[PDB]
Amino acid sequence: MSFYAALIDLLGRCAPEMHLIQAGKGEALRIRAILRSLVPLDDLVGIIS
Amino acid sequence: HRTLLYGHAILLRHAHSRMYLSCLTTSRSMTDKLAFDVGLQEDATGEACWWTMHPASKQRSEGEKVRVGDDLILVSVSSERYLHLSTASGELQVDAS
């Protein structure tokens, strides 16, 4: 299970910081949408719970 | 009137319905497998209509020309996924996986 946790952390580090590129540019949200589909919020709440 | 060059953004229109070939924002097949469907768009604008002919074989190189019947790979400008003939459980659908 540590392999996926590090993978989740790796995806978190490369995510856009905040709206300084997300709101202005459209590339930040495009990458954010791609990685959002990889980990839907439905499973994230189940893991933490 | 100008010839094509390898690694160029392309614009393809449907001859009959006069709509622009593009991608969608939805998927099917009930699997996650992020792959937007390929469908015609009402208008050209939307950033999801253009495609790029990227290198696909060692015979040709980036920055070179194209020939008759030259196989290549098409990549959507917005969707990083390639244009693929998704031979899924259906009748060999086409999806941007």
Swiss-Prot record, chain A:
The places in or outside the cell where this protein is found are: Sarcoplasmic reticulum membrane
Effect the entry attributes to changing residue 39 to G: Impairs interaction with FKBP1A
- Modifications made to the protein after synthesis: The N-terminus is blocked. Channel activity is modulated by phosphorylation.
- So which domain of life are we looking at? Eukaryota
Q: In which tissues is it expressed?
A: Detected in skeletal muscle (at protein level). Fast- or slow-twitch skeletal muscle.
Per the record, the coiled-coil ranges are none
**Functional summary from the UniProt entry:** Cytosolic calcium-activated calcium channel that mediates the release of Ca(2+) from the sarcoplasmic reticulum into the cytosol and thereby plays a key role in triggering muscle contraction following depolarization of T-tubules. Repeated very high-level exercise increases the open probability of the channel and leads to Ca(2+) leaking into the cytoplasm. Can also mediate the release of Ca(2+) from intracellular stores in neurons, and may thereby promote prolonged Ca(2+) signaling in the brain. Required for normal embryonic development of muscle fibers and skeletal muscle.
Family under the similarity heading? Belongs to the ryanodine receptor (TC 1.A.3.1) family. RYR1 subfamily.
Quote additional remarks.
Binding of [3H]ryanodine indicates that the heterozygous channel is activated by Ca(2+) concentrations 4-fold lower than normal. Single-cell analysis of cotransfected cells shows a significantly increased resting cytoplasmic Ca(2+) level and a significantly reduced luminal Ca(2+) level.
What binding partners and quaternary form does the record give?
Homotetramer. Can also form heterotetramers with RYR2. Identified in a complex composed of RYR1, PDE4D, PKA, FKBP1A and protein phosphatase 1 (PP1). Repeated very high-level exercise decreases interaction with PDE4D and protein phosphatase 1 (PP1). Interacts with CALM; CALM with bound calcium inhibits the RYR1 channel activity. Interacts with S100A1. Interacts with FKBP1A; this stabilizes the closed conformation of the channel. Interacts with CACNA1S; interaction with CACNA1S is important for activation of the RYR1 channel. Interacts with CACNB1.
Print the domain comment field: The calcium release channel activity resides in the C-terminal region while the remaining part of the protein constitutes the 'foot' structure spanning the junctional gap between the sarcoplasmic reticulum (SR) and the T-tubule. Pore opening is mediated via the cytoplasmic calcium-binding domains that mediate a small rotation of the channel-forming transmembrane regions that then leads to channel opening.
Write down what this protein is called. Answer: Ryanodine receptor 1
Whichever gene encodes this chain, its name is: RYR1
Report the portion of the entire protein shown: 2423 to 2471 of 5037
From Swiss-Prot, chain B:
> Which part of the full protein does this chain span, and how long is the full protein?
98 to 194 of 5037
| Other remarks on this protein | Binding of [3H]ryanodine indicates that the heterozygous channel is activated by Ca(2+) concentrations 4-fold lower than normal. Single-cell analysis of cotransfected cells shows a significantly increased resting cytoplasmic Ca(2+) level and a significantly reduced luminal Ca(2+) level.
Question: Domain MIR spans what residues?
Answer: 1-56, 63-97
The entry's family comment says:
Belongs to the ryanodine receptor (TC 1.A.3.1) family. RYR1 subfamily.
Query: Record's domain comment?
Result: The calcium release channel activity resides in the C-terminal region while the remaining part of the protein constitutes the 'foot' structure spanning the junctional gap between the sarcoplasmic reticulum (SR) and the T-tubule. Pore opening is mediated via the cytoplasmic calcium-binding domains that mediate a small rotation of the channel-forming transmembrane regions that then leads to channel opening.
Listed result of changing residue 67 to C: Decreases threshold for channel activation by K(+), caffeine and 4-chloro-m-cresol. Decreases inhibition by Mg(2+)
Record function comment = Cytosolic calcium-activated calcium channel that mediates the release of Ca(2+) from the sarcoplasmic reticulum into the cytosol and thereby plays a key role in triggering muscle contraction following depolarization of T-tubules. Repeated very high-level exercise increases the open probability of the channel and leads to Ca(2+) leaking into the cytoplasm. Can also mediate the release of Ca(2+) from intracellular stores in neurons, and may thereby promote prolonged Ca(2+) signaling in the brain. Required for normal embryonic development of muscle fibers and skeletal muscle.
For this UniProt entry, which residues form the secretion signal? none
This chain's source organism reads: Oryctolagus cuniculus (Rabbit)
Q: Quote the gene name from the UniProt entry.
A: RYR1
Quaternary organization? Homotetramer. Can also form heterotetramers with RYR2. Identified in a complex composed of RYR1, PDE4D, PKA, FKBP1A and protein phosphatase 1 (PP1). Repeated very high-level exercise decreases interaction with PDE4D and protein phosphatase 1 (PP1). Interacts with CALM; CALM with bound calcium inhibits the RYR1 channel activity. Interacts with S100A1. Interacts with FKBP1A; this stabilizes the closed conformation of the channel. Interacts with CACNA1S; interaction with CACNA1S is important for activation of the RYR1 channel. Interacts with CACNB1.
Q: Where in the cell is it found?
A: Sarcoplasmic reticulum membrane
Q: What is this protein called?
A: Ryanodine receptor 1
Source species taxonomy: Eukaryota, Metazoa, Chordata, Craniata, Vertebrata
Q: Tell me which tissues or organs this protein is expressed in.
A: Detected in skeletal muscle (at protein level). Fast- or slow-twitch skeletal muscle.
State the post-translational modifications.
Answer: The N-terminus is blocked.
